Amino acid sequence: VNSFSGYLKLTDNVYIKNADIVEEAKKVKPTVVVNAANVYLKHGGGVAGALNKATNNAMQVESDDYIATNGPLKVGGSCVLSGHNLAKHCLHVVGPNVNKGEDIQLLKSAYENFNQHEVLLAPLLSAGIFGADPIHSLRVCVDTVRTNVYLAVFDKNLYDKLVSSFL
Numbered sequence: 196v197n198s199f200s201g202y203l204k205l206t207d208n209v210y211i212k213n214a215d216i217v218e219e220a221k222k223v224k225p226t227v228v229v230n231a232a233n234v235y236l237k238h239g240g241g242v243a244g245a246l247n248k249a250t251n252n253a254m255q256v257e258s259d260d261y262i263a264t265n266g267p268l269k270v271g272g273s274c275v276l277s278g279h280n281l282a283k284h285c286l287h288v289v290g291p292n293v294n295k296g297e298d299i300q301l302l303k304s305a306y307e308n309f310n311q312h313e314v315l316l317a318p319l320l321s322a323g324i325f326g327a328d329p330i331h332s333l334r335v336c337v338d339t340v341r342t343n344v345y346l347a348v349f350d351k352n353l354y355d356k357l358v359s360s361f362l
């Protein structure tokens with residue numbers, strides 16, 4: 196049993212809710228919150244900009260030190276950093292950004308990072324301002340992630356569309 200409340204069960208291991216991942220993280224304090232990161236860990240907009248704002252920019256400060264030491268991530272890759280006031284850890288995962296012309300096939304590799312964590316709170320990778328189809332992202336998620344994932348969907352109309360079209 197875990198403390199994720201009001202989620203709709205999609206499969207054995209994937210659950211979904213219309214909610215602000217910022218509020219969900221603050222409330223549940225999950226072991227892992229997933230950030231929709233870019234390779235430079237520049238948290239400017241969308242999930243990344245929101246999670247960073249909620250940390251009072253501490254996420255960005257930590258991220259800048261990470262990049263200075265290690266260099267950029269790979270598209271499809273990830274790193275584990277602090278969750279600050281939101282979670283124990285933040286898994287920064289880079290899905291392909293279609294608005295940058297990146298290869299959507301890398302979305303499966305991006306979701307494979309979730310399998311290293313037994314339970315996660317997460318957004319849809321490559322969706323929103325990353326430019327890919329959100330129905331597609333949910334499908335890749337369910338077909339790739341085997342660990343327990345709680346997907347918080349910010350946009351109410353998108354949430355309704357995702358539930359109603361889920362196969």
Ligand SMILES: O=C(Nc1ccc(C(=O)N[C@@H]2c3ccccc3CC[C@@H]2C(=O)O)cc1)NC1CC1
Pocket residue numbers: 215216217240241242245317318319320322323324329347348349350353
């Ligand atoms: O800004 C705040 N949260 C906050 C800000 C931005 C987001 C965000 O970009 N979400 C994405 C998104 C957005 C629109 C349409 C589709 C998608 C799909 C991917 C992702 C998702 O929802 O899975 C989420 C939360 N909170 C403070 C109170 C205002």
